[PDB]
Design a protein around this nucleic acid. Structure first.
Ligand SMILES: Nc1nc2c(ncn2[C@@H]2O[C@H](COP(=O)(O)OP(=O)(O)OP(=O)(O)O)[C@@H](O)[C@H]2O)c(=O)[nH]1
Ligand SMILES: [Mg+2]
Lengths: 87, 49, 283, 46, 14, 103, 368, 360
RNA sequence: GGCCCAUUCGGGUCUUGUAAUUGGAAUGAGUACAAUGUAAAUACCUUAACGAGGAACAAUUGGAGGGCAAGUCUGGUGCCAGCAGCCGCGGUAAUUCCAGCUCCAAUAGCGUAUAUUAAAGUUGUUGCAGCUGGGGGGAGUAUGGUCGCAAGGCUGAAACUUAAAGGAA
């Protein structure tokens, strides 16, 4: 019957995820994964996120070099710079 | 404990050193580290003096 | 007495919600008799319908709608006591619950499970009915267990619900004095509107048939998903009359309506006064 | 690149959250402690 | 970041 | 406080401070309630973050005064009332599981 | 006349207007400017267009209800069929097509046949986000990705929930059990009810395994519905030092390659002593070994930790109970609990040997 | 499975009402008998806007482009931006977002980027002063169209920040059984990248037509100077008539183009407004669609709104046919009981709508 | 080793403890023979039999204070400060864990909210805008709240890189 083949495909996914539940974990759900408890370099293909200490060193681009460039254009145009003065 | 359950302020137990890494005895935790660090700091302070 | 007047006038205030129950021809209030297997129920439904409609309704089945007032009529149905599924469904749609308690044995987990399922799905009115008051010679322990059941029932329903005490069964059903003032308790209950029920069009089915074609069954051979008519009163919000309205029949699956023909009322209430024994009907 | 982007978006999120929580704290302080002190002021007359 | 929590998508078969 | 009564019934609008990142902070256990008598919106506490998930919305709350016995530390002075019931059930009994909240 | 013309839908709309006497264009149709100029040179056509709280809410809603009645008092097949339709107390026959065979075959009239009308939301599937709670009288704790039968609206259905926590409102990260005595969040693939609706949940619905305990296991309300959830499961990467200096160390095995360390450069690590640190550069010849810098000198008996987060998925599993399509109508069996599967196929429960706690005794700490 | 429509008419209303109702639709024969048959780029980018706003909705355009399959999903909102094409202004895309706007998880904070105005579409002032007050009294309270910069056609370059931040459950039931008394009549005359005298010429033309009615006329004036002016010369005028005791409004706008006299455009928009007042009753001919859409997605009650005879048209009843085609509801036009005019009062019983996306 | 005092340093004192083992006695709630009582029955009264070790035959209510994790969050002048913590790697037939953390008070009773009563410092004057109308001390300080006012930047000069003239240096 209609409910019969509904029931057997239900029982199919019943069986496949009940032995997913009994069967062995993925490594990636388990915590404390060492080096020897992983696929070797599964981590390049991982797309894993985390946090870092400090903002890394800025890569100097054309737009930031023209930013401080027309900054000092404005500055040395109006001569509002800062030096020492003689005593 | 005004609005706290005694099944809520339970006792979390602390973990031991891994048995593979057992020759370096006693995985030390934060109380052991502060006992280490303030000893080092008082001895460096008197050395600087 | 002014502070008393303020603190009493305060507890009249409640959350103002809509009603969505009509005042002209309201549906028959669904009374669900809920008990563990082996107490009351049948004998109790039989006794109540015999007092209400003067008709010995031996061998009950299904929902039973009778007229019990000048404008209050009500539907009697009984949960199968082993099924948590039917327990859950009638918890979700019942309006009054006659909660059968074996007072000799005490409280039980089937009635406790119904009380919690109802409490989470929108607690209806609950009148507790304690039977098997044949404890021993000890009227002392009768009174003791009486008080203990009343207090434990009062911690599960509001403090001041009605626990009713039925004596021993006499000639097949309960004493008619006790069933008379039990129906007096059912007749004044003052129902308050729930939420899921009053934003959802539901219906308990008292009549069922398949209007399929038997020679089509002879052609294809009993595997056929066959069409079905379902007759009954509907409660809650107005169910729309266009075909294609989606409907969950709670226990067989999800369907959509095909055609609705509303029928004249099989158990109608008639238009100080009293209720005529001519007009005490039964469907 | 992901380092710089993640750090600066986390800083932005924290600086937004602190402003939001401080805002709701002192709006609950001001426009309800005025009513608390008004009730205390008109209860001291009794 | 635009893809990260989407679930739909237009299916342009043109 | 409420006028002439000792308690007042109210309607839960929305759990204020639901995004506070500190458990059991006074900002977090802090509910906004519309009193039903005069219609005005006040703010009330709740005993803890643990009993904060017994109120959700339009819950028919009942609220009394607070009564601070001393200047607290993590306080927000300027919230006067505390929630003492919810849907006609005492939420201290709910918090210690003596009753179940009916709906 | 005009309503019958509008809803008589085999005639063109201009034919409705013609026998009574397009929306990409937003601004409506006007005349020519010259016709409108000669029409509105005059002005006098439109010169007359120119020139307690609880009882209050109840009065507003009863005012709406009397408006409902006095505007329902209209045409009889308009009211009683099509403008509202079948209010309450109407006795109806209702025909369903394609009802299963097993209902009509095994129809036992003891079990009630209830029907309820689904809203536009409740025909949608997807992730329902609830907050739930182990019921205080249910004995055993609940486990994520163990099925339980929910009673969510009209439907009863067995699903695989996964219990989460928003740990101080930062993540929504994944627990492995429900808490003992309070609420957690949860997320299950099921039919999307509206928010703020309550539900129960049951481990076992049959009677052969009904036991002696309390059978309702979970209670809760629904917080939110969505088509997707983004929940995470913490994974830490552990590595050990093998060459320690002041303030820096060489860390052995949390990575398998210098490409992996290059992927993870600059990340903050810490020892189990809470000494914070940062990984700096992959060493060249031993492959997964790198150089980290710490707050101060770590020891040879430490473990460093890189706390990362792995995303986890809810399992799109849904079977409604369909108890009335059985020959017994109790004894419904769905997916089993994980302890029941282990007891069936006799697998021992997974025991990490160095996950078990011990009785640590401190040695006295003396320094030189 | 799919409710089937034909032709590329009412396309935005069909996709909008399918998103509200949650019903999968197909639109078949999108201009199939044509030289370049199929969907155009502005309605394809409208589909992209729908995918931006919702989540889990699958749209499925065919090979030939002449039929589309919309299986809707949950409205989630969020902050976005939309770089709509030059074929339609930002009003063509912010008009169908005002229906979906108060019914999402997160509040609408979108900024559209493109041409500001068009002859045959909604403007910034149109959207704001006409279409925001009818939502403002249908239940929303915080809605705002901001102009950060505006761009006249053909090059445009103007950005518009639509922000709605009241996420209501459902719109309230309307009860407008009156014709609202017009208290004032105001407006806004705008001009970008042209001389500031054109605005005063437009204002003087509109007010010399308006001067013979005995109400009060006030037209505000904005020239746009700088980067806020956009990439093209343009100018236009939008008048509203304002009922202040209830909040109702009746608007009319247009824009000038290459060879247009500003006094001519001012008097044209003034006479077009007075004709909208004539053919209007409690709504406008263009405020009427979302008015009756919010009345049909209100509560499960009766909501009644007065309309006049001349507001009935092929557009209005094809709207009503599409409403009944999607979620099976009828309007009941009962006439008023006084006979100096022909006004119906449309009563709609709203479906039982709630927004189920907003977290509780 | 316990206890007591004290702001401090410290002082005063003394058979005191322990989920340590263990022993036989006691009976009461309950379960119940009866007889008495009474029209009859209930109850009171009298009363054989059984009835305790977690005496599990399982009294509460409120308060004070800790302590813990390869845990989480916030701040910032390393290792800290704070908020806190049912959420930890695994694990639920799994675990045996600060032995179920310690202490305190009432005890068949015990909290909370609101209103209150009593106590005397009961003045010797003048407290505002004057022909009556009144909030609550003096001196200050802070402000992620609400309402305002306020910055830019040579003017002309923007749709125009535009004149004369002026300013500034
Ligand atoms: N002594 C005594 N017996 C009762 C009482 N009420 C019901 N019964 C007995 O209960 C027996 C079982 O039948 P029902 O009471 O009809 O059973 P039910 O309560 O309907 O429960 P199900 O068997 O699950 O249907 C009957 O034969 C009655 O004699 C009562 O108050 N006292
Ligand atoms: Mg029976």
């Amino acid at each position: 019957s209609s409910f019969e083949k509904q029931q057997i495909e239900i029982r199919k996914q019943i069986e496949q995820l009940e032995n997913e539940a009994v069967a062995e974990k993925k490594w990636s759900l388990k915590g404390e994964v060492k080096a020897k408890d992983r696929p070797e370099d599964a981590l390049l293909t991982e797309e894993l996120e985390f946090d870092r200490t400090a903002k890394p060193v800025p890569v100097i681009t054309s737009e930031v070099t023209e930013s401080l460039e027309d900054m000092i254009r404005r500055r040395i145009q109006d001569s509002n710079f800062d030096d020492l003065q003689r005593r | 404990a005004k609005l706290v359950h005694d099944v809520q302020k339970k006792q979390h137990r602390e973990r031991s050193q891994l048995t593979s890494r057992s020759r370096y005895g006693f995985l030390e935790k934060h109380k052991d580290y502060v006992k280490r660090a303030q000893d080092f700091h008082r001895k460096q302070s008197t050395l600087k003096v | 007495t002014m502070q008393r007047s303020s603190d009493v006038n305060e507890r009249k205030l409640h959350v103002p919600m809509v009603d969505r129950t009509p005042e002209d021809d309201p549906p028959p209030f669904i009374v669900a008799v809920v008990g563990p297997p082996g107490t009351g129920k049948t004998t109790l439904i039989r006794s109540l319908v015999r007092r209400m409609t003067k008709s010995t309704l031996n061998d009950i089945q299904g929902p039973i709608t009778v007229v019990s007032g000048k404008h209050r009529r009500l539907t009697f149905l009984e949960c199968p006591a082993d099924d948590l599924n039917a327990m859950i469904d009638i918890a979700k749609i019942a309006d009054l619950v006659l909660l059968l308690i074996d007072g000799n044995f005490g409280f039980e987990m089937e009635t406790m499970e119904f009380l919690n399922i109802a409490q989470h799905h929108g607690m209806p009115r609950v009148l507790g009915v304690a039977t098997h008051l044949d404890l021993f010679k000890s009227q002392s322990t009768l009174r003791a267990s009486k008080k203990r059941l009343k207090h434990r029932f009062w911690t599960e329903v509001y403090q001041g619900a009605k626990l009713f005490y039925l004596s021993g069964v006499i000639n097949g059903r309960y004493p008619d004095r006790e069933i008379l003032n039990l129906s007096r308790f059912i007749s004044v209950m003052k129902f308050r509107p729930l939420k899921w029920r009053n934003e959802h069009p539901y219906m308990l089915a008292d009549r069922f048939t398949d209007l399929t074609h038997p020679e089509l069954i002879e052609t294809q051979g009993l595997q056929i998903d066959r069409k079905v008519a379902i007759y009954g009163y509907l409660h809650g919000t107005p169910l729309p009359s266009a075909p294609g309205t989606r409907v969950h029949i709670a226990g067989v699956g999800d369907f959509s309506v095909a055609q609705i023909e509303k029928l004249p009322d099989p158990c109608p209430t008639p238009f100080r006064k009293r209720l005529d024994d001519k007009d005490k009907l039964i469907y | 690149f992901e380092a710089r982007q993640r750090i600066e978006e986390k800083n932005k999120e924290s600086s937004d959250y602190h402003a939001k929580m401080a805002h709701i704290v002192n709006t609950i302080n001001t426009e309800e402690g005025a009513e608390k002190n008004k009730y205390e002021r008109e209860r001291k007359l009794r | 970041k635009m893809m990260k929590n989407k679930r739909g998508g237009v299916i342009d078969k043109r | 406080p409420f006028g002439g009564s000792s308690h007042a019934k109210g309607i839960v609008l929305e759990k204020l401070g639901i995004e506070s990142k500190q458990p059991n902070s006074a900002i977090r256990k802090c509910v906004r309630v519309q009193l039903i008598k005069n219609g005005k919106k006040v703010t009330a506490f709740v005993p803890n973050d643990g009993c904060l998930n017994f109120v959700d919305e339009n819950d028919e709350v009942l609220l009394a005064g607070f009564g601070r016995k001393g200047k607290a530390k993590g306080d927000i002075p300027g919230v006067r009332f505390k929630v003492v019931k919810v849907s006609g059930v005492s939420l201290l009994a709910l918090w210690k599981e003596k009753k179940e909240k009916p709906r | 006349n005009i309503g019958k013309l509008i809803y008589m839908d085999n005639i063109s709309p201009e034919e409705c207007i013609r026998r009574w006497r397009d929306l990409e264009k937003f601004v409506p149709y006007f005349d020519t400017f010259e016709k409108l100029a000669k029409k509105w040179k005059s002005v006098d056509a439109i010169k007359e267009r120119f020139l307690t709280w609880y009882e209050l809410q109840k009065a507003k809603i009863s005012k709406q209800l009397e408006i409902n009645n006095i505007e329902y008092q209209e045409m009889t097949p308009e009211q009683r069929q099509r403008i509202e339709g079948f209010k309450a107390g109407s006795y109806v026959r209702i025909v369903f097509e394609k009802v299963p065979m097993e209902f009509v075959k095994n129809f036992n009239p003891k079990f009630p046949i209830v029907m309820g009308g689904l809203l536009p939301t409740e025909i949608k599937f997807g992730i329902v986000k609830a907050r739930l709670r182990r019921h205080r009288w249910h004995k055993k704790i609940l486990k994520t990705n163990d099925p339980l039968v929910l009673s969510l609206g009209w439907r009863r259905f067995q699903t695989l929930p996964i219990y989460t926590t928003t740990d101080s409102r930062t993540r929504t990260r994944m627990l492995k059990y429900t808490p003992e005595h309070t609420y957690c969040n949860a997320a299950f693939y099921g039919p999307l009810c509206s928010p703020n609706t309550p539900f129960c949940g049951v481990q076992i619905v049959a009677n052969s395994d009904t036991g002696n305990g309390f059978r309702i296991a979970a209670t809760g309300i629904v917080e939110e519905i969505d088509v997707n959830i983004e929940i995470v499961k913490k994974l830490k990467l552990v590595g050990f030092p093998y060459k320690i200096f002041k303030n820096t160390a060489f860390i052995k095995d949390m990575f398998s390659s210098a490409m992996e360390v290059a992927r993870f450069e600059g990340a903050q690590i810490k020892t189990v002593s809470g000494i914070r640190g940062e990984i700096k550069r992959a060493l060249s010849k031993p492959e997964g070994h790198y150089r980290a810098a710490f707050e101060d000198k770590i020891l040879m008996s430490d473990i460093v930790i890189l706390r990362s987060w792995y995303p986890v998925r809810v399992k799109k599993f849904y079977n409604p109970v369909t108890s009335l399509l059985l020959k017994e109508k109790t004894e419904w069996k769905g997916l089993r609990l994980t302890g029941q599967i282990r007891a069936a196929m006799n697998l021992e429960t997974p025991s990490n040997p160095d996950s078990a706690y011990h009785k640590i005794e401190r040695v006295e700490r003396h320094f030189n | 499975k799919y409710t089937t429509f034909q032709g590329s008419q009412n396309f935005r209303l069909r996709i909008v009402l399918a998103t509200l109702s949650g019903k999968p639709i197909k639109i078949e024969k999108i201009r199939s008998g044509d030289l370049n048959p199929g969907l155009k780029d502005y309605e394809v980018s409208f589909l992209r806007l729908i995918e931006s706003v919702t989540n889990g909705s699958v749209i499925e355009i065919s090979y030939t482009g002449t039929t589309v399959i919309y299986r809707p999903g949950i409205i989630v909102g969020g902050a976005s931006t939309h770089i709509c094409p030059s074929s339609k202004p930002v009003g063509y895309f912010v008009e169908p977002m005002l229906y979906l706007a108060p019914f999402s998880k997160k509040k609408f904070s979108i900024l559209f980027k493109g041409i500001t105005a068009s002859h045959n579409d909604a403007g910034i002032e149109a959207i704001k002063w006409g279409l925001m007050p009818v939502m403002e009294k249908f239940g929303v309270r915080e809605c705002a169209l901001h102009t950060l910069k505006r761009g006249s056609p053909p090059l445009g370059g103007g950005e518009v920040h639509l922000v709605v931040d009241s996420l209501i459950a459902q719109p309230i039931t309307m009860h407008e059984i009156d014709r609202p008394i017009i208290s004032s009549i105001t407006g806004v005359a705008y001009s970008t990248r042209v001389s500031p005298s054109l605005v005063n010429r437009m204002i003087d033309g509109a007010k010399k037509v308006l001067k013979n009615l005995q109400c009060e006329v006030n037209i505000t004036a904005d020239v746009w100077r700088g980067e806020n002016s956009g990439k093209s010369p343009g100018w236009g005028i939008t008048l509203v008539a304002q009922s202040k005791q209830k909040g109702w409004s009746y608007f009319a706008e247009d824009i000038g183009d290459a060879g247009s006299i500003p006094e001519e455009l001012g008097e044209k928009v003034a006479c077009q407004l007075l004709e909208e007042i004539s053919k209007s009753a409690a709504v406008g001919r263009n405020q009427l669609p979302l008015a009756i859409v919010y009345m049909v997605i209100g509560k499960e009650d009766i909501g009644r709104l007065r309309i006049n005879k001349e507001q009935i048209d092929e557009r209005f009843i094809i709207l009503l046919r599409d409403i009944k085609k999607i979620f099976n509801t009828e309007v009941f036009l009962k006439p008023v009981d006084e006979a100096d005019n022909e006004d119906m009062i449309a009563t709609i019983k709203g479906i039982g709508f709630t927004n189920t996306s907003k977290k509780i």
